[PDB]
Enzyme design. Structure first.
Site, PDB file in Angstrom:
ATOM      1  N   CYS A 131       6.378   7.329   9.077  1.00 21.45           N
ATOM      2  CA  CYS A 131       7.311   8.062   8.245  1.00 21.45           C
ATOM      3  C   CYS A 131       6.728   7.946   6.824  1.00 21.45           C
ATOM      4  O   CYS A 131       6.346   6.849   6.396  1.00 21.45           O
ATOM      5  CB  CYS A 131       8.722   7.481   8.319  1.00 21.45           C
ATOM      6  N   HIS A 163       3.111   2.209   2.077  1.00 20.61           N
ATOM      7  CA  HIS A 163       3.400   2.682   3.423  1.00 20.61           C
ATOM      8  C   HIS A 163       4.740   2.061   3.855  1.00 20.61           C
ATOM      9  O   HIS A 163       5.059   0.945   3.432  1.00 20.61           O
ATOM     10  CB  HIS A 163       2.291   2.247   4.401  1.00 20.61           C
ATOM     11  N   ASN A 186       0.808  -1.234   0.000  1.00 22.85           N
ATOM     12  CA  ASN A 186       0.000   0.000   0.000  1.00 22.85           C
ATOM     13  C   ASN A 186       0.835   1.275   0.000  1.00 22.85           C
ATOM     14  O   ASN A 186       0.293   2.349   0.282  1.00 22.85           O
ATOM     15  CB  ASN A 186      -0.957   0.021   1.187  1.00 22.85           C
TER      16      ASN A 186
HETATM   17  C1  ELQ Z   1       1.289   1.324   9.131  1.00 24.05           C
HETATM   18  N1  ELQ Z   1       2.186   0.905  10.206  1.00 24.05           N
HETATM   19  C2  ELQ Z   1       3.376   1.762  10.263  1.00 24.05           C
HETATM   20  C3  ELQ Z   1       3.744   2.167  11.675  1.00 24.05           C
HETATM   21  N2  ELQ Z   1       2.615   2.847  12.314  1.00 24.05           N
HETATM   22  C4  ELQ Z   1       2.769   4.036  12.918  1.00 24.05           C
HETATM   23  O1  ELQ Z   1       3.811   4.674  12.817  1.00 24.05           O
HETATM   24  C5  ELQ Z   1       1.627   4.604  13.712  1.00 24.05           C
HETATM   25  C6  ELQ Z   1       1.013   5.784  13.317  1.00 24.05           C
HETATM   26  C7  ELQ Z   1      -0.011   6.340  14.075  1.00 24.05           C
HETATM   27  C8  ELQ Z   1      -0.383   5.724  15.234  1.00 24.05           C
HETATM   28  F1  ELQ Z   1      -1.367   6.241  15.998  1.00 24.05           F
HETATM   29  C9  ELQ Z   1       0.229   4.567  15.641  1.00 24.05           C
HETATM   30  F2  ELQ Z   1      -0.181   3.979  16.787  1.00 24.05           F
HETATM   31  C10 ELQ Z   1       1.248   4.016  14.913  1.00 24.05           C
HETATM   32  C11 ELQ Z   1       1.318   2.193  12.131  1.00 24.05           C
HETATM   33  C12 ELQ Z   1       1.474   0.834  11.487  1.00 24.05           C
END
Ligand code: ELQ
Ligand code: ELQ
EC number: 3.1.2.14
Lengths: 263, 263
Positions: free
Chosen positions: B222, B187, B185
């Site tokens: 990120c 990410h 996706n």
């Molecule tokens: C998609 N993956 C990448 C890592 N990831 C985060 O960096 C994250 C962003 C916002 C949040 F509230 C949280 F709890 C975690 C989520 C899972």
């Protein structure tokens, strides 16, 4: 995985993993390249090794000079891909070839070839293959020529020019992390393929599929070096000329070409 | 891979690959973390998925808030590792996924992991409590009685992690993801952040110690166009406090701790 009946080639099946696929839900070219190196290692292990007994005595190693990959269909996530040898090329060096097939249909979905040269591990000096070394590995190779790329004039043997500044596209300050290093702390050959592809614009990746990649390896990137990736379009099909060079002095590490077809 | 007899957990075997190992010829913690995510994806597919039907209509996804891994023995190159995974309900807070890693030959436990997942709206990124409707749709795939990879009343997997204060003892700056670091996706893969955290550990620690425990909190994603700085300070066996932050404004993306044992 196993050697075939004649013991002159090796086959292995791989189930494509969730983290191994891109946005199309098919294996990336870097995943294919990693599978090619894995089946290459398993073939060397099954036949007794890929440094021979005479190579270890003289502190000699096989190093990749060129990698050439052509993909017709990238296997999807959860699909099984079957990969199948080495050949002596006289005193120039060795060649390793691969054939990729869909396990269900048995059709050829890709092919690859790579050129290897003999190098002293310590001085990094290239040399020709001696007859003693050449005879020690001939018992593991087919005697008649067996080529993944047979055709009279094919893309795998083309001379690649040096990209001239200014580059049309670029990705600056690329550095390897520990995951990019092999068991000997050297940068993995597949990392350079990824770095070359970093300077292809995202719109090309989103609308085209990578069909061919030819990469020349000139010099190793050390884990403390920084790399710049440069690309210029040379062309329904798109062609690019590529150059990887050290960020500081501009020392060439790789040069290559890619060919993409519209989805 | 397959679901167990009761259909409440999933098992899969993996043969450790040549490119998956570090300088000690054993799987890196990033390879283990990739295998954990792979067996997690295969478990979700085997039971009909991990987005459920009500989650799909409400544009809701499961996101990782915390990852905790403990390794007693890293499998060697060519060894077979068996991983068992299961999920559990943690009320309206979220979900938990646990893993047990074993040596296939001896059957002994060589590692264990646990992860906390929270509900997020895919579009606005707003965290949410799960609520009765989604809980009832995935409780039929979880054991009803508690099954914990880390049972101990007061263990490392549930510890509060402090924020590293400047100046950091060690640092690795200007870290950027490449296409190989992205999932299907586009990410950044969760495993990439583990690698980035480890980039600020000095090479002498890596050469003389083995990573026993890693706890990582995920605060913010990120983007593939963001730049990251990795910071580490010794808090002590050796212990380290870690912080990943955006290179520009210094926005926190992750915080963690590692524990290393002398070889
Ligand atoms: C998609 N993956 C990448 C890592 N990831 C985060 O960096 C994250 C962003 C916002 C949040 F509230 C949280 F709890 C975690 C989520 C899972
Ligand atoms: C582990 N290495 C193997 C070879 N390699 C090179 O960069 C290379 C260096 C010197 C040469 F002569 C050559 F043909 C190639 C890529 C990674």
């Amino acid at each position: 995985g196993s050697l075939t009946e004649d013991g002159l080639s090796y086959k292995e099946k791989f189930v494509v993993r969730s983290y191994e696929v891109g946005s199309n839900k098919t294996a990336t070219v870097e995943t294919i390249a990693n599978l090619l190196q894995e089946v290459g290692c398993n073939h060397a292990q099954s036949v007794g090794f890929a440094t021979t007994t005479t190579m270890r005595k003289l502190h000699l190693i096989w190093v990749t000079a060129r990698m050439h990959i052509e993909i017709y269909k990238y296997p999807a996530w959860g699909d099984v891909v079957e990969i199948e040898w080495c050949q002596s090329e006289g005193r120039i060096g060795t060649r390793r070839d691969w054939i990729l097939k869909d396990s269900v249909t048995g059709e050829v979905t890709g092919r690859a070839t790579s050129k290897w040269v003999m190098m002293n591990q310590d001085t990094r000096r290239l040399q020709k293959v001696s007859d003693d070394v050449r005879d020690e590995y001939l018992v593991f190779c087919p005697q008649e020529p067996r080529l993944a790329f047979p055709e009279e004039n094919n893309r795998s043997l083309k001379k690649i020019p040096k990209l001239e500044d200014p580059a049309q596209y670029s990705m600056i300050g690329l550095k390897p992390r520990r995951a990019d290093l092999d068991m000997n702390q050297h940068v993995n050959n597949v990392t350079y393929i990824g770095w070359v592809l970093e300077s292809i614009p995202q719109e090309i990746v989103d609308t085209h599929e990578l069909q061919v990649i030819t990469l020349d390896y000139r010099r190793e990137c050390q884990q403390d070096d920084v790399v710049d990736s440069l690309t210029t379009t040379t062309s329904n099909d798109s062609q690019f000329l590529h150059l990887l060079r050290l960020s500081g002095d501009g020392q060439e590490i790789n040069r290559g070409t890619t060919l993409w077809r519209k989805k």
